[PDB]
Amino acid sequence: YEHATTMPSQAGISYNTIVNRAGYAPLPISITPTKIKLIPTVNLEYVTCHYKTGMDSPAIKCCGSQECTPTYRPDEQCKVFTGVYPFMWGGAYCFCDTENTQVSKAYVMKSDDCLADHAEAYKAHTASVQAFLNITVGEHSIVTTVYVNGETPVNFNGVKITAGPLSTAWTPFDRKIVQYAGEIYNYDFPEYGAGQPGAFGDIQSRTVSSSDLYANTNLVLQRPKAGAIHVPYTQAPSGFEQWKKDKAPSLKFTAPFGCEIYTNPIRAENCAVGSIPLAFDIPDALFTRVSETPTLSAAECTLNECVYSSDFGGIATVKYSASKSGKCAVHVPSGTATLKEAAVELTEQGSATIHFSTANIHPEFRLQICTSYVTCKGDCHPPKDHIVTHPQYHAQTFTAAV
Length: 402
Ligand SMILES: *[C@@H]1O[C@H](CO)[C@@H](O)[C@H](O)[C@H]1NC(C)=O
Prior knowledge:
- The protein has one helix spanning 239-245; strands spanning 2-8, 15-21, 24-48, 51-55, 59-61, 77-82, 87-88, 91-92, 101-110, 119-137, 140-148, 160-163, 176-180, 183-186, 203-204, 214-215, 220-221, 233-234, 260-263, 266-269, 275-281, 296-305, 314-322, 326-331, 337-339, 343-346, 349-358, 364-369, 373-377.
- 2% of the residues lie in helices and 46% in strands.
- By secondary structure, it is mainly beta.
- It has a domain at 288-377: Immunoglobulin-like.
- The chain is elongated.
- The strands form 8 sheets. Strands 2, 3, 10, 11, 13, 14, 19 and 20 form an 8-stranded antiparallel beta sheet that branches.
- It contains 1 helix and 29 strands.
- 2-acetamido-2-deoxy-beta-D-glucopyranose binds at residues 32, 34, 134, 143.
């Protein structure tokens, strides 16, 4: 039997329903998503880190000419400064006053700490939603991880569960993101091969172990001081450091819909966004006839207490006269009231207690119970505290009138 019902995509809050037919007893169904995960399809564009400016030892020729011998290292600068007269701890290096030459060259390379202190620049394409759910059908219970795509089923005990596509496809990650120190940032980093100096991406590598290294650090050499041996260089300050100094708070403190953000895998969890269109294919063999189950006759309902509140502040007693003692389900076919409990136990004729949370100030709802239903009605009072530390349990509704 094919049944389908939208389930609000809230983490920690439960959801209940009853599936029934003209000659088959109510079969309860309960769902509880303990963690809804939003993994995006992601690939690595590069990794960046602090640079370090390596530099070959100056090659000094005493009154002889030199040449800018080229090598091919990242962001290389090579220059042949003439008219030098260097000094060491032992005195003047050369005897010719003029015509001495010093060839000096400098280059960029990855910091020694880049293997463990680096930022990963990624592109995030599309979303994949998977949720850890607790599903019960007529006391057949399962705890699983369902891939929310409408395709992948979870088929334990013969009932086939399919969690349709997340109704409002949405991600907190833009197309192009960055990971650093276990925090995910939305940042339009330069494409590989366009990194500009003094900003994020000044040095880049396709992988942490990649041989290639593009560097654009605005490296330019200056002539050394007379009587000193060294390689002067003025360079744009490390763009990665500047990004660290100047960056907005991570998505874990700015993401919409209250999403939590985690980094392995890159993902967002507990996004209170949209709803999951669950579809349940219940086998014909799991249904039970109305005759077998406890049948209720001549029930009455009364709200012995009502506190219009986020939690289950509403209490109602049902006086029952059952045909045979046992257990059976209880529900409200309406968004007015959401029940804490799924089923109750009955002993011939007596009373039972139902907990619920409500939106209506003047509540009235049909409590469906054990192959019957009773019209519960009453007046309800406001709650105590202005602010509470948990999310809503009761479906909001327009009617809150006198
Ligand atoms: C779901 O099942 C798991 C089983 O480990 C349990 O720990 C968790 O509390 C259950 N959640 C609810 C309230 O259904």
